[PDB]
Design an enzyme around this catalytic site. Structure first.
Site, mmCIF file in Angstrom:
data_model
loop_
_atom_site.group_PDB
_atom_site.id
_atom_site.type_symbol
_atom_site.label_atom_id
_atom_site.label_comp_id
_atom_site.label_asym_id
_atom_site.label_seq_id
_atom_site.Cartn_x
_atom_site.Cartn_y
_atom_site.Cartn_z
ATOM 1 N N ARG A 177 0.854 -1.204 0.000
ATOM 2 C CA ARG A 177 0.000 0.000 0.000
ATOM 3 C C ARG A 177 0.876 1.235 0.000
ATOM 4 O O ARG A 177 0.773 2.079 0.900
ATOM 5 C CB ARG A 177 -1.043 -0.068 1.087
ATOM 6 C CG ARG A 177 -2.067 -1.183 1.077
ATOM 7 C CD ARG A 177 -3.045 -1.014 2.237
ATOM 8 N NE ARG A 177 -2.333 -1.200 3.539
ATOM 9 C CZ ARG A 177 -1.804 -2.346 3.958
ATOM 10 N NH1 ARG A 177 -1.972 -3.518 3.378
ATOM 11 N NH2 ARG A 177 -0.874 -2.332 4.976
ATOM 12 N N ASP A 242 1.904 -8.525 6.725
ATOM 13 C CA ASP A 242 0.834 -7.810 6.084
ATOM 14 C C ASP A 242 -0.467 -8.500 5.935
ATOM 15 O O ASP A 242 -1.511 -7.846 6.336
ATOM 16 C CB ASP A 242 1.359 -6.870 5.012
ATOM 17 C CG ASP A 242 0.444 -5.710 4.703
ATOM 18 O OD1 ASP A 242 0.193 -4.914 5.606
ATOM 19 O OD2 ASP A 242 0.014 -5.523 3.532
ATOM 20 N N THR A 243 -0.631 -9.697 5.537
ATOM 21 C CA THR A 243 -1.880 -10.371 5.248
ATOM 22 C C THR A 243 -2.885 -10.658 6.275
ATOM 23 O O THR A 243 -3.998 -10.016 6.265
ATOM 24 C CB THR A 243 -1.609 -11.521 4.173
ATOM 25 O OG1 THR A 243 -0.795 -12.531 4.894
ATOM 26 C CG2 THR A 243 -0.724 -10.892 3.059
ATOM 27 N N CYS A 348 -1.187 -20.143 -2.171
ATOM 28 C CA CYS A 348 -0.643 -19.701 -0.890
ATOM 29 C C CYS A 348 -0.179 -20.852 0.022
ATOM 30 O O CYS A 348 -0.993 -21.656 0.485
ATOM 31 C CB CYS A 348 -1.749 -18.940 -0.135
ATOM 32 S SG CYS A 348 -0.951 -18.043 1.279
ATOM 33 N N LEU A 349 1.127 -20.841 0.304
ATOM 34 C CA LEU A 349 1.696 -21.901 1.188
ATOM 35 C C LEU A 349 1.278 -21.585 2.651
ATOM 36 O O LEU A 349 1.200 -22.518 3.453
ATOM 37 C CB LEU A 349 3.226 -21.902 1.010
ATOM 38 C CG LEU A 349 3.831 -22.525 -0.230
ATOM 39 C CD1 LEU A 349 5.288 -22.095 -0.444
ATOM 40 C CD2 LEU A 349 3.825 -24.042 -0.126
HETATM 41 C C1 HEM Z 1 -5.265 -14.116 4.842
HETATM 42 C C2 HEM Z 1 -4.039 -14.297 4.505
HETATM 43 C C3 HEM Z 1 -3.352 -14.516 3.189
HETATM 44 C C4 HEM Z 1 -3.815 -14.381 1.943
HETATM 45 C C5 HEM Z 1 -5.199 -13.871 1.478
HETATM 46 C C6 HEM Z 1 -2.776 -14.794 1.016
HETATM 47 C C7 HEM Z 1 -2.858 -14.747 -0.360
HETATM 48 C C8 HEM Z 1 -1.891 -15.182 -1.216
HETATM 49 C C9 HEM Z 1 -1.983 -15.126 -2.699
HETATM 50 C C10 HEM Z 1 -3.242 -14.566 -3.390
HETATM 51 C C11 HEM Z 1 -0.896 -15.715 -3.177
HETATM 52 C C12 HEM Z 1 -0.515 -15.998 -4.648
HETATM 53 C C13 HEM Z 1 0.007 -14.772 -5.411
HETATM 54 C C14 HEM Z 1 0.291 -14.964 -6.842
HETATM 55 O O1 HEM Z 1 -0.220 -15.938 -7.438
HETATM 56 O O2 HEM Z 1 1.025 -14.051 -7.339
HETATM 57 C C15 HEM Z 1 -0.050 -16.094 -2.058
HETATM 58 C C16 HEM Z 1 1.137 -16.798 -2.141
HETATM 59 C C17 HEM Z 1 2.002 -17.083 -1.118
HETATM 60 N N1 HEM Z 1 1.652 -16.997 0.255
HETATM 61 FE FE1 HEM Z 1 -0.053 -16.257 1.005
HETATM 62 N N2 HEM Z 1 -1.674 -15.243 1.730
HETATM 63 C C18 HEM Z 1 -1.974 -14.998 3.067
HETATM 64 C C19 HEM Z 1 -1.124 -15.361 4.114
HETATM 65 C C20 HEM Z 1 0.155 -15.877 4.044
HETATM 66 C C21 HEM Z 1 1.046 -16.197 5.175
HETATM 67 C C22 HEM Z 1 0.685 -16.037 6.632
HETATM 68 C C23 HEM Z 1 2.200 -16.603 4.638
HETATM 69 C C24 HEM Z 1 3.470 -17.159 5.300
HETATM 70 C C25 HEM Z 1 4.350 -16.257 5.771
HETATM 71 C C26 HEM Z 1 2.070 -16.539 3.170
HETATM 72 C C27 HEM Z 1 2.973 -17.083 2.290
HETATM 73 C C28 HEM Z 1 2.827 -17.311 0.950
HETATM 74 C C29 HEM Z 1 3.846 -17.714 0.021
HETATM 75 C C30 HEM Z 1 5.191 -18.333 0.453
HETATM 76 C C31 HEM Z 1 3.304 -17.690 -1.204
HETATM 77 C C32 HEM Z 1 3.952 -18.099 -2.528
HETATM 78 C C33 HEM Z 1 3.705 -19.491 -3.067
HETATM 79 C C34 HEM Z 1 4.342 -19.681 -4.459
HETATM 80 O O3 HEM Z 1 4.671 -18.673 -5.128
HETATM 81 O O4 HEM Z 1 4.498 -20.856 -4.753
HETATM 82 N N3 HEM Z 1 0.771 -16.193 2.879
HETATM 83 N N4 HEM Z 1 -0.692 -15.805 -0.887
HETATM 84 C C1 LIG Z 2 5.858 -9.213 -5.533
HETATM 85 C C2 LIG Z 2 6.114 -10.733 -5.509
HETATM 86 C C3 LIG Z 2 5.751 -11.366 -4.149
HETATM 87 C C4 LIG Z 2 4.632 -10.601 -3.411
HETATM 88 C C5 LIG Z 2 4.914 -10.494 -1.897
HETATM 89 C C6 LIG Z 2 3.915 -11.297 -1.034
HETATM 90 C C7 LIG Z 2 2.549 -10.582 -0.845
HETATM 91 O O1 LIG Z 2 2.841 -9.174 -0.842
HETATM 92 C C8 LIG Z 2 1.931 -10.916 0.544
HETATM 93 N N1 LIG Z 2 1.579 -12.380 0.648
HETATM 94 C C9 LIG Z 2 2.493 -13.400 0.474
HETATM 95 C C10 LIG Z 2 1.851 -14.589 0.649
HETATM 96 N N2 LIG Z 2 0.603 -14.323 0.950
HETATM 97 C C11 LIG Z 2 0.405 -12.963 0.948
HETATM 98 C C12 LIG Z 2 1.557 -10.868 -1.982
HETATM 99 C C13 LIG Z 2 0.257 -10.347 -1.888
HETATM 100 C C14 LIG Z 2 -0.687 -10.570 -2.888
HETATM 101 C C15 LIG Z 2 -0.349 -11.323 -4.010
HETATM 102 CL CL1 LIG Z 2 -1.507 -11.604 -5.237
HETATM 103 C C16 LIG Z 2 0.938 -11.851 -4.122
HETATM 104 C C17 LIG Z 2 1.892 -11.630 -3.123
HETATM 105 CL CL2 LIG Z 2 3.449 -12.312 -3.380
#
Ligand code: HEM
Ligand SMILES: CCCCCC[C@](O)(Cn1ccnc1)c1ccc(Cl)cc1Cl
Length: 405
Positions: A177, A242-243, A348-349
């Site tokens: 943001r 952040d999430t 999302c892992l």
């Molecule tokens: C309500 C909470 C959360 C939401 C809505 C969310 C949402 C997302 C989304 C939409 C993506 C895919 C982005 C893309 O395709 O460019 C993503 C990927 C990812 N998330 Fe989350 N996330 C959340 C929480 C978290 C938490 C707590 C962690 C761990 C610190 C995290 C770690 C990851 C990682 C490692 C990926 C990448 C997976 C990959 O690229 O294979 N997320 N997340």
């Molecule tokens: C710019 C490449 C990686 C982005 C950083 C991760 C995150 O900002 C937060 N997050 C990470 C995992 N879950 C939330 C996010 C938010 C929304 C979307 Cl669509 C993708 C990413 Cl990567």
């Protein structure tokens, strides 16, 4: 500040949506984005804001684009381009097959088995935090719970000092943001300045923390580089910080306004999981995109190599073709359809962790403070961006209606 329409964009496909400052932001962030799904808006639009980019408006398109890594590349996932360009986070800035090795490692750190191990601390911290607020009859949910709760659990997992929070959180906020105080690359570097020394330290003298495991992991039979560990950890940091933080605020704001939903959860706890899914659909909050690797014709629209497209994960579950009465929260929906945690190979892992954190919060808050509301005359402000947020959430309650545990 609109950018000139490229030759290939039919003028009928123009819809100037500013993902950073959408128009009826006053109404709510989800409501502000949902304008994109009105009858007057084509399925696939071009906005001249934020330098010009496409936006897929419908769940079907969002999912297809997400599945299709051949055409839609994660190389430049953020808008505006400079940001998508400056970000080199792993595994997010990569496509399969490359992505898979890195993912496998990140999963080691955040996965199911880790949440399972961390469950007692999550419960412990939630209870402690809530119990501490209870007798006060008032907080700042955003500063008082939504921040410390998920953050402190992350700090614990990463083995980083709580003293770092304020500094890290600022850098993180700048990324999703943007404010205008920094620039994307500058923000990225500051986080990197932080991370480097720590990683170096953990390569020499490993711990059991997530950073130690990442800094010392194997990828495609060889050891990860320092640069690669830096790049994964950067992602982990943003996810952790952040999430979950923003999500709980939307959910709490909703609960604070809907007595009947509170009650439902109180009486029929077997619904918690279902409710958690419904809130994840209704208060979905992430919007990123992809970059075209080539000229490609998608649902009759001509896309040019190098065009960015926003594929708003938030939008899928708000799509009426996907969910009847999308804006309505219904815990007993037959099918809650969303892509809140993404779709395709980038799923999302951290979803397991996030779900555990939500469910604990609902159960534990409702247990002790069943009856609460938004403070009289408070004006709740949402904020739009890659991750959407709530500015502050002033709540009030009568301590006499609480229950100590
Ligand atoms: C309500 C909470 C959360 C939401 C809505 C969310 C949402 C997302 C989304 C939409 C993506 C895919 C982005 C893309 O395709 O460019 C993503 C990927 C990812 N998330 Fe989350 N996330 C959340 C929480 C978290 C938490 C707590 C962690 C761990 C610190 C995290 C770690 C990851 C990682 C490692 C990926 C990448 C997976 C990959 O690229 O294979 N997320 N997340
Ligand atoms: C710019 C490449 C990686 C982005 C950083 C991760 C995150 O900002 C937060 N997050 C990470 C995992 N879950 C939330 C996010 C938010 C929304 C979307 Cl669509 C993708 C990413 Cl990567």
């Amino acid at each position: 500040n609109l950018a000139p329409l490229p030759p290939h964009v039919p003028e009928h496909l123009v819809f100037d949506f500013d993902m950073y400052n959408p128009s009826n932001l006053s109404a709510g962030v989800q409501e502000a984005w949902a304008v994109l799904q009105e009858s007057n808006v084509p399925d696939l639009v071009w906005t001249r804001c934020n330098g010009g980019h496409w936006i897929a408006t419908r769940g079907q398109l969002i999912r297809e684009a997400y599945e299709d890594y051949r055409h839609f590349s994660s190389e430049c996932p953020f808008i505006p381009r400079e940001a998508g360009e400056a970000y080199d986070f792993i595994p997010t800035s990569m496509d399969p097959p490359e992505q898979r090795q890195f993912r496998a490692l990140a999963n080691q750190v955040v996965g199911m088995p880790v949440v399972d191990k961390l469950e007692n601390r999550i419960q412990e911290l939630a209870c402690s935090l809530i119990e501490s607020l209870r007798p006060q009859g008032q907080c700042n949910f955003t500063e008082d719970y939504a921040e410390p709760f998920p953050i402190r659990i992350f700090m614990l997992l990463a083995g980083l000092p709580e003293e770092d929070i304020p500094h890290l959180k600022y850098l993180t906020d700048q990324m999703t943001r943007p404010d205008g105080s920094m620039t994307f690359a500058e923000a990225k570097e500051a986080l990197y300045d932080y991370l480097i020394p720590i990683i170096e330290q953990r390569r020499q003298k490993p711990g059991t923390d997530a950073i130690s495991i990442v800094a010392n992991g194997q990828v495609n039979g060889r050891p990860i580089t320092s640069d690669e560990a830096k790049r994964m950890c950067g992602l982990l940091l943003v996810g952790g910080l952040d999430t979950v933080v923003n999500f709980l605020s939307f959910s709490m704001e909703f609960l604070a306004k809907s007595p009947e939903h509170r009650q439902e959860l109180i009486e029929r706890p077997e619904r918690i999981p279902a409710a958690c899914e419904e809130l994840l659909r209704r208060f979905s909050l992430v919007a990123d995109g992809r970059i075209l690797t080539s000229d490609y014709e998608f649902h009759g629209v001509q896309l040019k190599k190098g065009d960015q497209i926003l594929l708003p994960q938030m939008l899928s579950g708000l799509d009426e073709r996907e969910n009847a009465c999308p804006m309505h929260v219904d815990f007993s929906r037959q099918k809650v359809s969303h892509t809140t945690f993404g779709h395709g190979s980038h799923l999302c892992l951290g979803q397991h962790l996030a779900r555990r954190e939500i469910i604990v919060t609902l159960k534990e808050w409702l247990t002790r403070i069943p009856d609460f509301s938004i403070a009289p005359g408070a004006q709740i402000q949402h904020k739009s961006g890659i991750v959407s947020g709530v500015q502050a959430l002033p709540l009030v309650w009568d301590p006499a209606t609480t229950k100590a545990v």
